[PDB]
Amino acid sequence: MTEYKLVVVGAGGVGKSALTIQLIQNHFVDEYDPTIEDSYRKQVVIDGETCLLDILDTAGQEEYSAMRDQYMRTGEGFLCVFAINNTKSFEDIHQYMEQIKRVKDSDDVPMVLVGNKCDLAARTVESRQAQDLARSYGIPYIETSAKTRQGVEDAFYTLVREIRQH
Ligand SMILES: Nc1nc2c(ncn2[C@@H]2O[C@H](COP(=O)(O)OP(=O)(O)NP(=O)(O)O)[C@@H](O)[C@H]2O)c(=O)[nH]1
Ligand SMILES: [Ca+2]
Ligand SMILES: [Mg+2]
Ligand SMILES: [Mg+2]
């Protein structure tokens, strides 16, 4: 069966681990334990196809930025997460996407831009601002809540479907 190497990237605290754990383990992690680098694998059916999702949950803390080159080298698709209540994380995710492009020396890296924490009402990134950023990359924008599960499957499965357009 096809294996898909997904990598979840973004600034600290935007909910990378919460999104991944919700997808793989179907529960919401309320506490905040900063990640170094964790890996998850799960067999799922997507569009009638049995596949293996290999998911790398990466560090948002800048203290571990040295590890980025290795995982950007090997990742096949990138879930580029920011939190809609964190304008700085939106500015940061643009930097992540440029770094991925640079490390991979490619203009066509499979990516999905994800605006997480859409259950919160303290929004400072409007959907249209994120839509514009995605459009300049030619990639989808999807809003999610790891807390309510809204959009979580859509976001990860869209990224699978992006890898398959390539
Ligand atoms: N309300 C709400 N809180 C969320 C959501 N996603 C994550 N959180 C909360 O935000 C905090 C950080 O989540 P976490 O997944 O650890 O973020 P992270 O991006 O993995 N952090 P790091 O980069 O340091 O590993 C946690 O308290 C978590 O419960 C969401 O969609 N909604
Ligand atoms: Ca803890
Ligand atoms: Mg984490
Ligand atoms: Mg504004």
Swiss-Prot record:
Positions glycosylated per UniProt: T35
Result of changing Y32F: Loss of interaction and recruitment to plasma membrane of PLCE1
Effect on the protein upon substituting T144I: GTP-binding activity reduced by factor of 25
Record flagged with keyword Glycoprotein: yes
Effect on the protein upon substituting A59T: Loss of GTPase activity and creation of an autophosphorylation site
Record's bilayer topology term: Lipid-anchor
Means of activity regulation: Alternates between an inactive form bound to GDP and an active form bound to GTP. Activated by a guanine nucleotide-exchange factor (GEF) and inactivated by a GTPase-activating protein (GAP).
Known disease link: Costello syndrome: A rare condition characterized by prenatally increased growth, postnatal growth deficiency, intellectual disability, distinctive facial appearance, cardiovascular abnormalities (typically pulmonic stenosis, hypertrophic cardiomyopathy and/or atrial tachycardia), tumor predisposition, skin and musculoskeletal abnormalities. Congenital myopathy with excess of muscle spindles: Variant of Costello syndrome.
Effect of A83T: GTP-binding activity reduced by factor of 30
Subunit structure: In its GTP-bound form interacts with PLCE1. Interacts with TBC1D10C. Interacts with RGL3. Interacts with HSPD1. Found in a complex with at least BRAF, HRAS, MAP2K1, MAPK3 and RGS14. Interacts (active GTP-bound form) with RGS14 (via RBD 1 domain). Forms a signaling complex with RASGRP1 and DGKZ. Interacts with RASSF5. Interacts with PDE6D. Interacts with IKZF3. Interacts with RACK1. Interacts with PIK3CG; the interaction is required for membrane recruitment and beta-gamma G protein dimer-dependent activation of the PI3K gamma complex PIK3CG:PIK3R6. Interacts with RAPGEF2.
Classification via SMART domains: RAB, RAS, RHO
Cell compartment(s), UniProt: Cell membrane; Golgi apparatus; Golgi apparatus membrane
Gene label: HRAS
Gene3D superfamilies: P-loop containing nucleotide triphosphate hydrolases
GO molecular function: G protein activity; GDP binding; GTP binding; GTPase activity; phospholipase C activator activity; protein-membrane adaptor activity
Identification of the protein by name: GTPase HRas
Taxonomic lineage: Eukaryota, Metazoa, Chordata, Craniata, Vertebrata
In-chain residues carrying the UniProt-annotated modification S-nitrosocysteine: C118
